[PDB]
Symmetry: D2
Subunit: 498 residues, 4 copies
């Protein structure tokens, strides 16, 4: 017998040893006599409409596909739990943190970003690391990435950015001109691009990478005080990356390497886990931070903002039905329980709207009714009703209007969001020149070593070489601004390729 993943059916069959097989039926529960032949008028006669068994089955088959996630299409999933290991109640009143030892069920989905559903796992691309906490105060979705930062600092460019990362609207081909025209034109990307083209650009499976909330968030405590925070979840399996050669080879031998790896890890009991930490920055600290504490292209230096342990994330359960538990899963950053709130980070602010929006499309108006999306650890009650595919009792006959003198659900004052005062004009503040290099310099010079700097360049050049000369120069100019050697080294490599 092979790996647990390939023995799926066998095991399933074996689990129903002394069991009689179920009667094959139509979607309406009507028993089927022969689902192996269609109804024709005579052996060599035409098909009949009366064959509803056929139609019923075919019609469903003709409808099993839904739109894939506009981004992070390709992915994997697992379930497990979150466990509180440390007291951070002085920062957040969130029930999910209330007591050390408290466990909250979680659902996770790892994923690449650019490729569609049939693309490979072992390719350079950041990785999605979404977490769904089913808490008593509703679901908390920490839709993070394997990176603490991102390519841009303003939501309105995301569509374009994604467009540049995807296929040429006409040829339907990946287009390095698109990729680098955008990147060279928008140097804020410089930070994430460096991360991207480094060794961590292609993690060895999902268990060997870190997770981050990336954006700065706000934590409010029982007394109502509030501080800003960052979420970090380090792999307990340790960071491990794939060499470009192996990544390339595997992308050929097993496009689903990531899915397979995870399933077998859990299937054999090697349950992966991550240690959950947070970074805290008081309003006063934020005021004097050397950068914009909400700029997604920046990080909070550990030296200045030490990691504060919070708990453990553990995945011990594989999905039973991928489509139902993984494909259909939906995470909304806007899903925050009392104690956790949003920060003025423009990128975040954007995602606040986008996620429920896209879900209403990809999945449907009542996507939250879907089992894996349902906040089963909370009592959903409100004045919302109906909608396509209303799968529950639709809250029965409870009064559907607020306020009302008939005892329908009431709002609880203690759940009010924290309020801060802001000043200045209401307009479009440009942020294209918000220091696009400083931290990148620190990364290149202080974080990486010679060996790694070499590879990073080789990686950037290997792809960049296919872009037009003028783009190459533009890109290189920005790289030179990060550090002279960074740009020069790349250029040299380009010279050879060209």
């Amino acid at each position: 017998s092979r790996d647990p993943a390939s023995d799926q059916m066998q095991h399933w069959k074996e689990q129903r040893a002394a069991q009689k097989a179920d009667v094959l039926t139509t979607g309406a529960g009507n028993p089927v006599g022969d689902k192996l032949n269609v109804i024709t008028v005579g052996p060599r006669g035409p098909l009949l409409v009366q064959d509803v068994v056929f139609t019923d089955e075919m019609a469903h088959f003709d409808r099993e596909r839904i739109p894939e996630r506009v981004v992070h299409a390709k992915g994997a999933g697992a379930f497990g739990y979150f466990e509180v290991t440390h007291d951070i109640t002085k920062y957040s009143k969130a029930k999910v943190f209330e007591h050390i030892g408290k466990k909250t069920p979680i659902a996770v989905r790892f994923s690449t970003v650019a490729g569609e559903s049939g693309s490979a796992d072992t390719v350079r691309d950041p990785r999605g690391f979404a977490v769904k906490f089913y808490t008593e105060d509703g679901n908390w979705d920490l839709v993070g990435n394997n990176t603490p930062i991102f390519f841009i600092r303003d939501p309105i460019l995301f569509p374009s950015f994604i467009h540049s990362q995807k296929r040429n609207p006409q040829t339907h081909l990946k287009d390095p001109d698109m990729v680098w025209d955008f990147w060279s034109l928008r140097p804020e990307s410089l930070h994430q691009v460096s991360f991207l083209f480094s060794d961590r650009g292609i993690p060895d499976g999902h268990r060997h990478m870190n997770g981050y909330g990336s954006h700065t968030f706000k934590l409010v405590n029982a007394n109502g005080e509030a501080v800003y925070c960052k979420f970090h979840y380090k792999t307990d399996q340790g960071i491990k990356n794939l060499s470009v050669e192996d990544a390339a080879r595997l992308s050929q031998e097993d496009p689903d390497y990531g899915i397979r790896d995870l399933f077998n890890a859990i299937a054999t009991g090697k349950y992966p886990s991550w240690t959950f930490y947070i970074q805290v920055m008081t309003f006063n600290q934020a005021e004097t931070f050397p950068f914009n504490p909400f700029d997604l292209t920046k990080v909070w230096p550990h030296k200045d903002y030490p990691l504060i342990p919070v708990g453990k994330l553990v995945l011990n359960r594989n999905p039973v039905n991928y489509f139902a538990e993984v494909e259909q899963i939906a995470f909304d950053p806007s899903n925050m329980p009392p104690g956790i709130e949003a920060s003025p980070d423009k990128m975040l602010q954007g995602r606040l709207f986008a996620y429920p929006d896209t879900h209403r499309h990809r999945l449907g108006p009542n996507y939250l009714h879907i089992p894996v999306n349902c906040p089963y650890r909370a009592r959903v009650a409100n004045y919302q009703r109906d909608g396509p595919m209303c799968m529950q009792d639709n809250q029965g006959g409870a009064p559907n209007y607020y306020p009302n003198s008939f005892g329908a659900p009431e709002q609880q004052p203690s759940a009010l969001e924290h309020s801060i005062q802001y000043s200045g004009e209401v307009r479009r503040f440009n942020t294209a020149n918000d220091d696009n290099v400083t931290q990148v310099r620190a990364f290149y010079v202080n974080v990486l070593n010679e060996e790694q700097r070499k590879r990073l360049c080789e990686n950037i050049a290997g792809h960049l070489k296919d872009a037009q000369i003028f783009i190459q120069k533009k890109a290189v100019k920005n790289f030179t601004e990060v550090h002279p050697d960074y740009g020069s080294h790349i250029q040299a490599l380009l010279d050879k390729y060209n």
Copy 2:
């Protein structure tokens, strides 16, 4: 205090007297601090995207509506059961009738035909009387009307007919020219038209009308022997209609009369019931039938095909949430368990396709998952998977292909459909010219007395008068063919109106 219906909220409140109101939450189950004021910058400042509570509720509100039924849009719903009173196992083997005293849960929806959701109940129009039986062999939908016949005998004319019965494509107004041009051009309608324009055209509520399967179906017993049949469910509350005047008055005073009546009736304990009967024609009789036994414009004279008592239909339960239980309910005539099958009635044949098709549209691909539509008294097991809003376990990790050697669901021979021999050309056989007057003549002369015949002509005249003269002439020519008196009486009336 008032009618049970009007006291709806009051009761709900009373039933929950001793308990505390639920906590108002968003869709993701997050508690809400204030759902009465949105978030703004300062008292008179703009709105924030951060106010997801707002967006969450609005977004759902924005999506409450689903496509109303393409026909029979306005209706009422209720629940109860069907009880077998007589043994007809010698004709059918369907579990629904397996033994006297057996009870099967039922769902029923009454409706008009042409009008849209906000139309009145008390208007001349046939009435929908659909029943859903939750059988062990899956669901059985007996989608019937309050008439044993219909206006046309070929499905391909249905869309047209319906169009002629709805609004003018440009003015969006009802159009007597459209209605009568079709009817006058298509005389098969004479029969039903006559029935529609009689006192039965406006039933006093849904409790005082009969129900019919209309089409000729086929029953199969345990020996494999089959026969054709008709279904009839006579009102035990007795036939009762509304006068033209009262209906007109009611349409204005209470457009929802039927809904109110039914709800209250049940709410007060006066559960309505119908005696279920069947007619039976052997294959031999089918050969000697003076007309086409599968012609939806023909009836089986009670004289030669006596009604056979089978059981009772009982509605003892009001819906709890209209949208979820009535609006979303779907009936498919194709849903027939072993022991009950379709006949070659072209109309029925067409219906075998239409319903599940249209349901996949207004409700959705997995419309059968919806609670009210689920065949909860049977275990649904097959090789159908995925699809939008797949609210279930999607049958987990079970093998998804048939055949398979891993224990998945199996076809059951006993459930094989009965088969009839057929020979001939595969083409479009015209039926426009089948008998369109004989049975109509019987109805006019015999089923109706002088008072009724008078009213019928007035009703027709009252409406036909607004059609152009040529149309009037054509239409009068048809009636005259049924009977000189019929044609003349109408013309006499038309002359006066003109």
Copy 3:
């Protein structure tokens, strides 16, 4: 008979000599016979080979789309807008750029609660949405036949609507729901008073006024901004329907409004409205006795006189109601340079809702629908794909911005007007803002003895079916408006009970 009734006859005549076109499937395949399906033998079963059938049936099975969540019942027409006065000092919007300038428009009138098959002549406010196809993109002025509204915060809308519609269980209209809500939210008094007055049931769409209702902002070439109110008065005059008549018409002709408008236009009696605006400077807004952005308040014409701008003329009926009316979509957010929103919470909420609901009711690419596309402007951006992409998807143009390949460029002059606000970012309760003053002035001055009487009996007529306690809560609110208002009402309730 009337033009409407002759719709088909005229179509037939319009061709006259012409033979009929060939009947084809959706794929354009000619149909041999569309009156009989394919069976095996005269009395045999139906074949799947009959695709002509399936083709037609399948489409029929999908004819419907969700009716508008509200204002489902309506009527439409088209025409134009003509500038007659120069207000370029207040707005640089191209629609007003010059006296005599004509811009095509699209209008849809509607009721509110009732669904698609409900009657026209019922008490309810009336939607008066206008779509301007300008060179600077479409401008949707989504108005009502009233200057005010029942609430001042958006988060209460879904709730209000619910109360106005059917009970969730019985599916019936519930006066308890209606009044419990109103009685609990007295800010509704103003509009409620308007609703139960003679204007409650206009005599058709041609005899009522149109209002932008909300406070908006105009911006001129110099970058100077002012607040405004859009008003469009019927040139056919205000004409209402007595309850008795409305009732009868609701039975006799549930579509009286649709027929009336159609026949009017079909017979050359093109209806028109005179477009006006009220203006308030930023400083005036500082001293206004109430929140100038409160949707339950009006700007006294006495302190803010109407300034004529142009005319609104409807002279073209729809050719296909579905395609041209049912599918039409108005987005309050559709405002060209020169016209912007004000901080009116309600409006702010609508900015979001309409396009949102539209993607649901019509689809992602609902702007590609003929009646909905800005045909007077050239759409060029980085938006691509999505369901039913009916244009050319902007061909092979670079789909990312910025780009070095000549794709569309933003134009600075289009930047919105920037104001500087302050205060904490939170939910500021507004339930206690003045809820009576203007209402009292409506009852005392806008109305006369007869109107007040009717108003009271109309309210009583409906309010009497609600539970006594709600009746009490309601009357109390009315009494705060005016003692006689409350007293007259209660007296009537007393007889009813």
Copy 4:
């Protein structure tokens, strides 16, 4: 400069060198002032709903995706024309064949089968070769493959088959057990499986493979005489295949190799073309045929049924916008003009419903309104109306019902389908046991040479080795029935891999 494909944007640019860039607008046509920054209160404040520019663009981005084709998701498209070169009007009256020299615009889409959108092109899997002829009598969709046969012969087994070719429902991976269990259990597949694992299993791009309608169709002439036929379109570029190694390499170096190849060829004037042929069989021959002429697992021996030249298929136009022209395109086998009809081939009979059914799903009710699918060379006139995204004048105020006395479209008597006499029971006849080996043996023995047989076996064993031994045994037994050397060779190889 590089390959035309990669110079996409630059050429687009240059073609507009002589004109100012268009004004960036909202979807509503409202000019945008700054689409690079969102509106916020202050430099570090939250996002406002007022920013409709952001929402507008974002909302659409959120809806870019639609469901990918349930099968043949990965594909490439091109446009060109069909030109008649010989006369077959004695066989068919179809307008597309009426005269030599007649050209007809065509749309074509190539594809794989099992893989999803982000999958590699150069893989072992059949190839879709669909053609759409925009004819005066409407569109004609000849939805063929690069093979004259298929794995199964009955429609109802299709979903299963596909399911077995795709991912495991739980693990979401490819499953050789699923793949081979089905095939081994259904020996009908032998023939097509043999083709699949032959050298033509991986053609060198789309230009070096053939195309066939596979199904037996029916042709009717101007005299009403009918015959049966097959459609073959041989590549004028010649058969050229890729070795496993290469396909493996390319699938990594360039997953879209197919797309690129096709694009560049057309872009550089090397327009690919195919010679269109037909085989004919008379009704009398249909009776003397050794097998069921309508059996999709059977071919018509060239010797007995010679190829008859008809015309040429030429492709000279690349898509301008892939999504709008390729992703959205739709082919319906049921789209057949007078002169061309369906045969009693079950598989075909099934496809007759599936295609337009699945299109109403992945595209929409009005999917025929999409330009590329619109039958622009014909005048669409009927009684159909409304429906989501009705992008037309909806046939204006024309009478929507048939028949009518108002001059609306009329049916054309000369468009009636040719009728055939049939006789038999309306039932499910089994076909699993028709001949599953003879024609397969011929291919192995007479068509293939030694080294070709060798490779064939190596490819089969190379995949099958990962299935459960018992599956291997059944499979081998099947291959042995075809020929001893076939099974023995494969077993020999299996023994080594194990």
